[PDB]
mmCIF file of all heavy atoms in Angstrom:
data_model
loop_
_atom_site.group_PDB
_atom_site.id
_atom_site.type_symbol
_atom_site.label_atom_id
_atom_site.label_comp_id
_atom_site.label_asym_id
_atom_site.label_seq_id
_atom_site.Cartn_x
_atom_site.Cartn_y
_atom_site.Cartn_z
ATOM 1 N N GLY A 1 8.221 29.214 40.883
ATOM 2 C CA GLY A 1 8.466 28.646 42.196
ATOM 3 C C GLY A 1 7.965 27.225 42.345
ATOM 4 O O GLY A 1 8.063 26.631 43.420
ATOM 5 N N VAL A 2 7.420 26.672 41.267
ATOM 6 C CA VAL A 2 6.912 25.306 41.295
ATOM 7 C C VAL A 2 7.656 24.440 40.291
ATOM 8 O O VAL A 2 7.869 24.844 39.148
ATOM 9 C CB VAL A 2 5.403 25.255 40.967
ATOM 10 C CG1 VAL A 2 4.927 23.815 40.828
ATOM 11 C CG2 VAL A 2 4.601 25.999 42.022
ATOM 12 N N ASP A 3 8.057 23.251 40.724
ATOM 13 C CA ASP A 3 8.629 22.271 39.815
ATOM 14 C C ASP A 3 7.550 21.288 39.382
ATOM 15 O O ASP A 3 6.724 20.866 40.191
ATOM 16 C CB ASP A 3 9.788 21.530 40.481
ATOM 17 C CG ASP A 3 10.952 22.445 40.813
ATOM 18 O OD1 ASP A 3 11.078 23.517 40.180
ATOM 19 O OD2 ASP A 3 11.743 22.085 41.709
ATOM 20 N N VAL A 4 7.554 20.925 38.104
ATOM 21 C CA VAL A 4 6.517 20.048 37.573
ATOM 22 C C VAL A 4 7.062 18.667 37.248
ATOM 23 O O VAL A 4 8.189 18.530 36.772
ATOM 24 C CB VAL A 4 5.876 20.630 36.301
ATOM 25 C CG1 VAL A 4 4.715 19.758 35.843
ATOM 26 C CG2 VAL A 4 5.406 22.047 36.550
ATOM 27 N N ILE A 5 6.258 17.645 37.520
ATOM 28 C CA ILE A 5 6.540 16.293 37.050
ATOM 29 C C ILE A 5 5.297 15.744 36.355
ATOM 30 O O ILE A 5 4.191 16.213 36.604
ATOM 31 C CB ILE A 5 6.988 15.352 38.194
ATOM 32 C CG1 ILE A 5 5.991 15.387 39.354
ATOM 33 C CG2 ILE A 5 8.394 15.721 38.669
ATOM 34 C CD1 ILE A 5 6.252 14.324 40.423
ATOM 35 N N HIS A 6 5.480 14.761 35.480
ATOM 36 C CA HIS A 6 4.360 14.219 34.715
ATOM 37 C C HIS A 6 4.155 12.724 34.925
ATOM 38 O O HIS A 6 3.299 12.108 34.287
ATOM 39 C CB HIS A 6 4.535 14.520 33.232
ATOM 40 C CG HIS A 6 4.669 15.978 32.933
ATOM 41 N ND1 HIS A 6 3.680 16.891 33.233
ATOM 42 C CD2 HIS A 6 5.675 16.685 32.365
ATOM 43 C CE1 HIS A 6 4.071 18.097 32.862
ATOM 44 N NE2 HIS A 6 5.278 18.000 32.331
ATOM 45 N N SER A 7 4.932 12.145 35.833
ATOM 46 C CA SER A 7 4.840 10.716 36.094
ATOM 47 C C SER A 7 5.115 10.401 37.560
ATOM 48 O O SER A 7 5.937 11.059 38.201
ATOM 49 C CB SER A 7 5.824 9.957 35.200
ATOM 50 O OG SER A 7 5.786 8.568 35.468
ATOM 51 N N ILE A 8 4.420 9.396 38.088
ATOM 52 C CA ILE A 8 4.703 8.913 39.434
ATOM 53 C C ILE A 8 6.174 8.535 39.556
ATOM 54 O O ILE A 8 6.814 8.808 40.572
ATOM 55 C CB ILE A 8 3.839 7.689 39.797
ATOM 56 C CG1 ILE A 8 2.406 8.123 40.097
ATOM 57 C CG2 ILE A 8 4.409 6.979 41.016
ATOM 58 C CD1 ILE A 8 2.282 8.959 41.352
ATOM 59 N N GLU A 9 6.713 7.916 38.509
ATOM 60 C CA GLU A 9 8.096 7.450 38.534
ATOM 61 C C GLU A 9 9.088 8.601 38.730
ATOM 62 O O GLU A 9 10.192 8.399 39.235
ATOM 63 C CB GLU A 9 8.425 6.653 37.269
ATOM 64 C CG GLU A 9 7.500 5.464 37.042
ATOM 65 C CD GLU A 9 7.473 4.497 38.221
ATOM 66 O OE1 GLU A 9 8.545 3.962 38.582
ATOM 67 O OE2 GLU A 9 6.380 4.263 38.782
ATOM 68 N N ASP A 10 8.688 9.808 38.343
ATOM 69 C CA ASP A 10 9.541 10.978 38.531
ATOM 70 C C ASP A 10 9.827 11.243 40.007
ATOM 71 O O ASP A 10 10.863 11.801 40.354
ATOM 72 C CB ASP A 10 8.909 12.218 37.895
ATOM 73 C CG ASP A 10 8.921 12.170 36.382
ATOM 74 O OD1 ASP A 10 9.941 11.733 35.809
ATOM 75 O OD2 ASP A 10 7.913 12.578 35.767
ATOM 76 N N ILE A 11 8.898 10.848 40.870
ATOM 77 C CA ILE A 11 9.037 11.082 42.305
ATOM 78 C C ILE A 11 10.317 10.458 42.851
ATOM 79 O O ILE A 11 10.998 11.042 43.696
ATOM 80 C CB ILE A 11 7.825 10.523 43.074
ATOM 81 C CG1 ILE A 11 6.567 11.324 42.720
ATOM 82 C CG2 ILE A 11 8.086 10.519 44.579
ATOM 83 C CD1 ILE A 11 5.284 10.758 43.302
ATOM 84 N N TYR A 12 10.651 9.277 42.346
ATOM 85 C CA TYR A 12 11.790 8.521 42.860
ATOM 86 C C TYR A 12 13.141 9.154 42.521
ATOM 87 O O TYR A 12 14.178 8.742 43.051
ATOM 88 C CB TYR A 12 11.722 7.066 42.381
ATOM 89 C CG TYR A 12 10.399 6.405 42.712
ATOM 90 C CD1 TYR A 12 9.495 6.067 41.714
ATOM 91 C CD2 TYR A 12 10.050 6.134 44.030
ATOM 92 C CE1 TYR A 12 8.284 5.472 42.016
ATOM 93 C CE2 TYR A 12 8.841 5.542 44.344
ATOM 94 C CZ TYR A 12 7.962 5.213 43.333
ATOM 95 O OH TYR A 12 6.757 4.624 43.644
ATOM 96 N N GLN A 13 13.126 10.164 41.655
ATOM 97 C CA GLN A 13 14.352 10.865 41.271
ATOM 98 C C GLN A 13 14.576 12.144 42.076
ATOM 99 O O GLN A 13 15.624 12.774 41.967
ATOM 100 C CB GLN A 13 14.354 11.187 39.773
ATOM 101 C CG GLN A 13 14.962 10.101 38.905
ATOM 102 C CD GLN A 13 14.261 8.768 39.064
ATOM 103 O OE1 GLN A 13 13.150 8.572 38.566
ATOM 104 N NE2 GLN A 13 14.909 7.839 39.760
ATOM 105 N N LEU A 14 13.589 12.527 42.879
ATOM 106 C CA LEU A 14 13.715 13.714 43.714
ATOM 107 C C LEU A 14 14.653 13.445 44.891
ATOM 108 O O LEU A 14 14.502 12.447 45.596
ATOM 109 C CB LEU A 14 12.340 14.154 44.215
ATOM 110 C CG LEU A 14 11.296 14.351 43.114
ATOM 111 C CD1 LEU A 14 9.910 14.525 43.713
ATOM 112 C CD2 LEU A 14 11.670 15.536 42.233
ATOM 113 N N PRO A 15 15.635 14.334 45.101
ATOM 114 C CA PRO A 15 16.591 14.163 46.199
ATOM 115 C C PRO A 15 15.988 14.533 47.552
ATOM 116 O O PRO A 15 15.019 15.297 47.615
ATOM 117 C CB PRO A 15 17.707 15.160 45.853
ATOM 118 C CG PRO A 15 17.440 15.602 44.428
ATOM 119 C CD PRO A 15 15.973 15.483 44.245
ATOM 120 N N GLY A 16 16.562 13.996 48.624
ATOM 121 C CA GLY A 16 16.250 14.449 49.967
ATOM 122 C C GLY A 16 14.994 13.826 50.538
ATOM 123 O O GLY A 16 14.523 12.801 50.052
ATOM 124 N N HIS A 17 14.451 14.448 51.579
ATOM 125 C CA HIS A 17 13.216 13.967 52.186
ATOM 126 C C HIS A 17 11.996 14.469 51.413
ATOM 127 O O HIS A 17 11.732 15.676 51.351
ATOM 128 C CB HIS A 17 13.136 14.396 53.648
ATOM 129 C CG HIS A 17 12.123 13.632 54.439
ATOM 130 N ND1 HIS A 17 12.024 13.726 55.811
ATOM 131 C CD2 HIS A 17 11.165 12.757 54.051
ATOM 132 C CE1 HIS A 17 11.045 12.944 56.234
ATOM 133 N NE2 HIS A 17 10.507 12.346 55.185
ATOM 134 N N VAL A 18 11.260 13.533 50.821
ATOM 135 C CA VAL A 18 10.100 13.864 50.002
ATOM 136 C C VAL A 18 8.795 13.492 50.696
ATOM 137 O O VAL A 18 8.618 12.356 51.134
ATOM 138 C CB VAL A 18 10.177 13.174 48.627
ATOM 139 C CG1 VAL A 18 8.882 13.382 47.847
ATOM 140 C CG2 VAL A 18 11.372 13.702 47.839
ATOM 141 N N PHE A 19 7.890 14.462 50.796
ATOM 142 C CA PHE A 19 6.593 14.254 51.425
ATOM 143 C C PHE A 19 5.486 14.214 50.380
ATOM 144 O O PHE A 19 5.298 15.178 49.629
ATOM 145 C CB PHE A 19 6.293 15.380 52.423
ATOM 146 C CG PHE A 19 7.206 15.395 53.621
ATOM 147 C CD1 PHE A 19 8.407 16.090 53.588
ATOM 148 C CD2 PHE A 19 6.860 14.716 54.782
ATOM 149 C CE1 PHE A 19 9.248 16.104 54.692
ATOM 150 C CE2 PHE A 19 7.697 14.725 55.891
ATOM 151 C CZ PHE A 19 8.892 15.423 55.847
ATOM 152 N N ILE A 20 4.755 13.105 50.334
ATOM 153 C CA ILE A 20 3.548 13.024 49.519
ATOM 154 C C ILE A 20 2.421 13.818 50.186
ATOM 155 O O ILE A 20 1.919 13.443 51.246
ATOM 156 C CB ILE A 20 3.107 11.576 49.302
ATOM 157 C CG1 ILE A 20 4.263 10.754 48.716
ATOM 158 C CG2 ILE A 20 1.883 11.542 48.395
ATOM 159 C CD1 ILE A 20 4.798 11.286 47.388
ATOM 160 N N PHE A 21 2.018 14.905 49.534
ATOM 161 C CA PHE A 21 1.263 15.981 50.166
ATOM 162 C C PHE A 21 -0.226 15.989 49.789
ATOM 163 O O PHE A 21 -0.961 16.884 50.196
ATOM 164 C CB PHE A 21 1.920 17.311 49.764
ATOM 165 C CG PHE A 21 1.651 18.464 50.706
ATOM 166 C CD1 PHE A 21 2.144 18.455 51.999
ATOM 167 C CD2 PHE A 21 0.945 19.580 50.274
ATOM 168 C CE1 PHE A 21 1.918 19.527 52.855
ATOM 169 C CE2 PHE A 21 0.717 20.655 51.122
ATOM 170 C CZ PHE A 21 1.202 20.627 52.415
ATOM 171 N N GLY A 22 -0.669 14.996 49.019
ATOM 172 C CA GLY A 22 -2.066 14.902 48.604
ATOM 173 C C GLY A 22 -2.243 15.068 47.099
ATOM 174 O O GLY A 22 -1.262 15.315 46.395
ATOM 175 N N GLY A 23 -3.469 14.919 46.588
ATOM 176 C CA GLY A 23 -4.640 14.586 47.382
ATOM 177 C C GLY A 23 -4.978 13.104 47.300
ATOM 178 O O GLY A 23 -4.079 12.263 47.338
ATOM 179 N N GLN A 24 -6.265 12.779 47.195
ATOM 180 C CA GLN A 24 -6.687 11.377 47.209
ATOM 181 C C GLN A 24 -5.919 10.546 46.196
ATOM 182 O O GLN A 24 -5.403 9.479 46.531
ATOM 183 C CB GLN A 24 -8.195 11.220 46.968
ATOM 184 C CG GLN A 24 -8.614 9.750 46.777
ATOM 185 C CD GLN A 24 -10.121 9.525 46.843
ATOM 186 O OE1 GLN A 24 -10.865 10.336 47.391
ATOM 187 N NE2 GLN A 24 -10.573 8.400 46.298
ATOM 188 N N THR A 25 -5.835 11.037 44.959
ATOM 189 C CA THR A 25 -5.193 10.267 43.899
ATOM 190 C C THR A 25 -3.733 9.952 44.227
ATOM 191 O O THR A 25 -3.284 8.823 44.051
ATOM 192 C CB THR A 25 -5.282 10.973 42.515
ATOM 193 O OG1 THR A 25 -4.447 12.137 42.508
ATOM 194 C CG2 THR A 25 -6.717 11.380 42.208
ATOM 195 N N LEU A 26 -2.998 10.951 44.708
ATOM 196 C CA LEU A 26 -1.594 10.752 45.062
ATOM 197 C C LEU A 26 -1.438 9.727 46.185
ATOM 198 O O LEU A 26 -0.560 8.865 46.140
ATOM 199 C CB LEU A 26 -0.935 12.068 45.483
ATOM 200 C CG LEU A 26 0.042 12.679 44.486
ATOM 201 C CD1 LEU A 26 1.078 11.644 44.057
ATOM 202 C CD2 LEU A 26 -0.735 13.207 43.291
ATOM 203 N N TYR A 27 -2.277 9.837 47.209
ATOM 204 C CA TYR A 27 -2.214 8.890 48.317
ATOM 205 C C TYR A 27 -2.484 7.465 47.834
ATOM 206 O O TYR A 27 -1.771 6.531 48.197
ATOM 207 C CB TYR A 27 -3.194 9.273 49.421
ATOM 208 C CG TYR A 27 -2.876 10.594 50.097
ATOM 209 C CD1 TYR A 27 -3.873 11.528 50.327
ATOM 210 C CD2 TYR A 27 -1.586 10.895 50.524
ATOM 211 C CE1 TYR A 27 -3.604 12.726 50.945
ATOM 212 C CE2 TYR A 27 -1.304 12.107 51.151
ATOM 213 C CZ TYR A 27 -2.323 13.012 51.361
ATOM 214 O OH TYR A 27 -2.082 14.218 51.985
ATOM 215 N N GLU A 28 -3.515 7.301 47.012
ATOM 216 C CA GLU A 28 -3.860 5.983 46.494
ATOM 217 C C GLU A 28 -2.696 5.381 45.720
ATOM 218 O O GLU A 28 -2.405 4.192 45.842
ATOM 219 C CB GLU A 28 -5.120 6.060 45.623
ATOM 220 C CG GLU A 28 -6.384 6.325 46.434
ATOM 221 C CD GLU A 28 -7.622 6.516 45.573
ATOM 222 O OE1 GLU A 28 -7.484 6.654 44.339
ATOM 223 O OE2 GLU A 28 -8.737 6.532 46.136
ATOM 224 N N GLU A 29 -2.020 6.219 44.939
ATOM 225 C CA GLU A 29 -0.903 5.777 44.115
ATOM 226 C C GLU A 29 0.364 5.498 44.929
ATOM 227 O O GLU A 29 1.221 4.724 44.497
ATOM 228 C CB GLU A 29 -0.597 6.819 43.033
ATOM 229 C CG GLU A 29 -1.741 7.067 42.057
ATOM 230 C CD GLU A 29 -1.447 8.202 41.085
ATOM 231 O OE1 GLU A 29 -1.580 9.383 41.479
ATOM 232 O OE2 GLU A 29 -1.080 7.912 39.927
ATOM 233 N N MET A 30 0.491 6.122 46.097
ATOM 234 C CA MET A 30 1.754 6.055 46.841
ATOM 235 C C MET A 30 1.732 5.275 48.159
ATOM 236 O O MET A 30 2.788 4.950 48.697
ATOM 237 C CB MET A 30 2.292 7.469 47.099
ATOM 238 C CG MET A 30 2.588 8.264 45.836
ATOM 239 S SD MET A 30 3.780 7.422 44.775
ATOM 240 C CE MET A 30 5.231 7.478 45.821
ATOM 241 N N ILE A 31 0.553 4.985 48.697
ATOM 242 C CA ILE A 31 0.502 4.414 50.046
ATOM 243 C C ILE A 31 1.260 3.086 50.169
ATOM 244 O O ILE A 31 1.814 2.782 51.227
ATOM 245 C CB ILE A 31 -0.939 4.272 50.582
ATOM 246 C CG1 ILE A 31 -0.912 3.900 52.074
ATOM 247 C CG2 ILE A 31 -1.733 3.265 49.744
ATOM 248 C CD1 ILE A 31 -2.252 4.024 52.784
ATOM 249 N N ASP A 32 1.299 2.304 49.094
ATOM 250 C CA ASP A 32 2.028 1.036 49.120
ATOM 251 C C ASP A 32 3.522 1.222 48.876
ATOM 252 O O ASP A 32 4.275 0.252 48.869
ATOM 253 C CB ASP A 32 1.470 0.062 48.077
ATOM 254 C CG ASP A 32 0.102 -0.472 48.442
ATOM 255 O OD1 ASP A 32 -0.238 -0.483 49.644
ATOM 256 O OD2 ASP A 32 -0.635 -0.882 47.519
ATOM 257 N N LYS A 33 3.949 2.464 48.682
ATOM 258 C CA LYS A 33 5.322 2.731 48.267
ATOM 259 C C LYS A 33 6.143 3.514 49.293
ATOM 260 O O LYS A 33 7.372 3.477 49.266
ATOM 261 C CB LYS A 33 5.324 3.486 46.934
ATOM 262 C CG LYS A 33 4.519 2.816 45.837
ATOM 263 C CD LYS A 33 5.255 1.623 45.260
ATOM 264 C CE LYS A 33 4.328 0.777 44.400
ATOM 265 N NZ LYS A 33 3.527 1.626 43.474
ATOM 266 N N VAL A 34 5.480 4.238 50.189
ATOM 267 C CA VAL A 34 6.218 5.112 51.105
ATOM 268 C C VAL A 34 6.884 4.359 52.262
ATOM 269 O O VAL A 34 6.439 3.283 52.653
ATOM 270 C CB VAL A 34 5.335 6.244 51.660
ATOM 271 C CG1 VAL A 34 4.875 7.162 50.524
ATOM 272 C CG2 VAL A 34 4.147 5.668 52.412
ATOM 273 N N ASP A 35 7.954 4.938 52.803
ATOM 274 C CA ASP A 35 8.633 4.372 53.966
ATOM 275 C C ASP A 35 7.780 4.535 55.222
ATOM 276 O O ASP A 35 7.668 3.621 56.046
ATOM 277 C CB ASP A 35 9.984 5.063 54.175
ATOM 278 C CG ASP A 35 10.866 5.008 52.940
ATOM 279 O OD1 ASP A 35 10.941 3.932 52.319
ATOM 280 O OD2 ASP A 35 11.482 6.039 52.591
ATOM 281 N N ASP A 36 7.179 5.711 55.366
ATOM 282 C CA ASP A 36 6.441 6.031 56.573
ATOM 283 C C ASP A 36 5.370 7.077 56.293
ATOM 284 O O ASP A 36 5.291 7.618 55.189
ATOM 285 C CB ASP A 36 7.395 6.515 57.672
ATOM 286 C CG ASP A 36 8.178 7.747 57.269
ATOM 287 O OD1 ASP A 36 8.148 8.121 56.079
ATOM 288 O OD2 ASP A 36 8.825 8.349 58.145
ATOM 289 N N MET A 37 4.546 7.357 57.297
ATOM 290 C CA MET A 37 3.457 8.310 57.141
ATOM 291 C C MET A 37 3.354 9.207 58.361
ATOM 292 O O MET A 37 3.421 8.737 59.496
ATOM 293 C CB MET A 37 2.123 7.577 56.921
ATOM 294 C CG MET A 37 2.165 6.514 55.827
ATOM 295 S SD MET A 37 0.519 5.953 55.312
ATOM 296 C CE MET A 37 0.034 4.917 56.700
ATOM 297 N N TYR A 38 3.206 10.505 58.112
ATOM 298 C CA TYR A 38 2.885 11.459 59.157
ATOM 299 C C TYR A 38 1.407 11.792 59.050
ATOM 300 O O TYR A 38 0.986 12.531 58.159
ATOM 301 C CB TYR A 38 3.740 12.714 59.010
ATOM 302 C CG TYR A 38 5.201 12.458 59.305
ATOM 303 C CD1 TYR A 38 6.078 12.077 58.298
ATOM 304 C CD2 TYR A 38 5.696 12.570 60.601
ATOM 305 C CE1 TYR A 38 7.416 11.827 58.573
ATOM 306 C CE2 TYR A 38 7.031 12.327 60.886
ATOM 307 C CZ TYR A 38 7.883 11.957 59.872
ATOM 308 O OH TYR A 38 9.210 11.721 60.158
ATOM 309 N N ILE A 39 0.618 11.236 59.962
ATOM 310 C CA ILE A 39 -0.831 11.360 59.869
ATOM 311 C C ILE A 39 -1.395 12.150 61.035
ATOM 312 O O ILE A 39 -1.170 11.803 62.191
ATOM 313 C CB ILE A 39 -1.506 9.974 59.851
ATOM 314 C CG1 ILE A 39 -1.057 9.180 58.624
ATOM 315 C CG2 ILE A 39 -3.027 10.103 59.883
ATOM 316 C CD1 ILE A 39 -1.888 7.933 58.361
ATOM 317 N N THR A 40 -2.135 13.207 60.729
ATOM 318 C CA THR A 40 -2.930 13.865 61.753
ATOM 319 C C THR A 40 -4.338 13.291 61.708
ATOM 320 O O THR A 40 -5.070 13.501 60.737
ATOM 321 C CB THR A 40 -2.972 15.393 61.559
ATOM 322 O OG1 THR A 40 -1.634 15.899 61.478
ATOM 323 C CG2 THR A 40 -3.694 16.067 62.728
ATOM 324 N N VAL A 41 -4.708 12.540 62.739
ATOM 325 C CA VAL A 41 -6.076 12.055 62.854
ATOM 326 C C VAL A 41 -6.945 13.151 63.446
ATOM 327 O O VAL A 41 -6.747 13.552 64.598
ATOM 328 C CB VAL A 41 -6.189 10.819 63.759
ATOM 329 C CG1 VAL A 41 -7.651 10.380 63.871
ATOM 330 C CG2 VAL A 41 -5.331 9.684 63.227
ATOM 331 N N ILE A 42 -7.891 13.645 62.656
ATOM 332 C CA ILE A 42 -8.855 14.617 63.148
ATOM 333 C C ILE A 42 -9.990 13.837 63.802
ATOM 334 O O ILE A 42 -10.710 13.095 63.132
ATOM 335 C CB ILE A 42 -9.433 15.485 62.014
ATOM 336 C CG1 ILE A 42 -8.317 16.028 61.110
ATOM 337 C CG2 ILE A 42 -10.283 16.611 62.591
ATOM 338 C CD1 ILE A 42 -7.425 17.065 61.760
ATOM 339 N N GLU A 43 -10.143 13.999 65.111
ATOM 340 C CA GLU A 43 -11.062 13.164 65.876
ATOM 341 C C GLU A 43 -12.501 13.657 65.759
ATOM 342 O O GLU A 43 -13.143 13.989 66.759
ATOM 343 C CB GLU A 43 -10.616 13.106 67.343
ATOM 344 C CG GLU A 43 -9.119 12.825 67.518
ATOM 345 C CD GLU A 43 -8.775 11.342 67.484
ATOM 346 O OE1 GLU A 43 -9.710 10.516 67.413
ATOM 347 O OE2 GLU A 43 -7.569 11.005 67.531
ATOM 348 N N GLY A 44 -13.003 13.684 64.526
ATOM 349 C CA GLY A 44 -14.366 14.088 64.245
ATOM 350 C C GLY A 44 -14.882 13.471 62.954
ATOM 351 O O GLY A 44 -14.151 12.768 62.251
#
């Protein structure tokens, strides 16, 4: 039930709406690349 990729560049080949889901490393690698962000600010 899981698809595997081995490179950041593989992300760009995924069809449809793609959500970068974590964690720290993925965000660091992708924040300069995404169109938009859905952020829940936890006020604590």
